[PDB]
Amino acid sequence: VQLVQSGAEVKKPGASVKVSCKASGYTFTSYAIHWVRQAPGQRLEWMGWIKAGNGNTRYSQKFQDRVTITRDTSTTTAYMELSSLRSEDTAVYYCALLTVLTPDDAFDIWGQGTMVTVSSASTKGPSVFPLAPSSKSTSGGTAALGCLVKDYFPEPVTVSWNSGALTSGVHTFPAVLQSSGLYSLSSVVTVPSSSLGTQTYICNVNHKPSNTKVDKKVEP
Amino acid sequence: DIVMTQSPDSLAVSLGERATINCKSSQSVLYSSNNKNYLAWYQQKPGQPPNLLIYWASTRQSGVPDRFSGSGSGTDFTLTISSLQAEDVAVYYCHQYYSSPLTFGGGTKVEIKRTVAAPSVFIFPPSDEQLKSGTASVVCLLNNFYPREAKVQWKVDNALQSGNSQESVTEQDSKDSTYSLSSTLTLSKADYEKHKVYACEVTHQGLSSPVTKSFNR
């Protein structure tokens, strides 16, 4: 069972956003997809559900006038439109098959979440710079290297190493907010210093709001 | 609105110790006619969505390790982790599906207590590619330390800097329960070219005196 959501967005105050939720690995028309939002430092907030086969909906009293959940059975996709976006609406929005408890089976699946940022500031893609391994970045037979992902908006960027084949030793730091209003983050990995000559280290940087997909080889 | 109130808000325990999280519902979620409690427990690690551990108050979902167990009935519910492992660092939420709207608790953040580990400190000059843009970023990395409290100071040509740096600290590591921290000094290229010595000085409990890592431009 799998739920796959659309990428993060930024929208002006007063505008609308429409988050998508593609489901698969199960019978779409048999269950209700919920929408739940996780705001900064606040508890999860149930917004509504939609019966995927039938199309009936129920909305939280909070999000009655401003939310519209919909589905398309042919593409196995649910949607959540939130209009008249306000400052407080910046949050991560999840679709989820909440506690499907049937006689046959019991499962609970969440989409990966979609960060919506309500702001008048413009979308900007990051610049990716190498943090090259050097004599100033070695300790105990290991070398640290990384990528600096500077000056993007809105959050988030994600970073993988070697297309997901390198995960041990990886630290991808929470973003920092510069006085410019733009974000920056670093991703570092510690590797054996003995094999810098034979191994290749590539950071794969994604910033879906700006359609940025960058691969940066990090060399000595 | 059924209000779900968890306690404690956070709890730190050593590896292998027992962890107890309490959740109280503002009204009963027990239906006497079927004797079921409409309560669930979720685990959320950073970057991940909530993950269902327990439903019907005490039924562990398939694949959930046996050390997680729910108990209680009516309004007073308990999630127990019998022997905490390093990967269990997360926020745990209770959840009711008794009445609309569905609601969740405020979360209990579970942290690991561990032995002191001093940071491994590294420094990265700016790349030539960035300098082409008129800005220089110097990155100081403090890797795999514990406890989280650490102090970084930037020095340029031996002078203590103020106002031109930003820090970020990671979540607690799922494997060794350490933290890591990156600090970035930002200068114009002109200012960067004006000075020779760039240094980051680190204070931490595992160090008897500050460690300075430096390079010459």
């Binding site: 269950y31 209700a32 919920h34 559900w49 019966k51 129920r58 098959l97 909440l98 506690t99 499907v100 408890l101 049937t102 006689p103 | 979620v29 239906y31 006619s33 079927n34 079921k36 409409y38 599906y97 008794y98 009445s99 609309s100 709207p101 569905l102």
Partner: peptide, 13 residues
């Protein structure tokens, strides 16, 4: 009593 429409996915059985 529970509201079975709070989460249609739950079969109270």
């Amino acid at each position: 009593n529970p509201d079975p429409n709070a989460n249609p996915n739950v079969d109270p059985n």
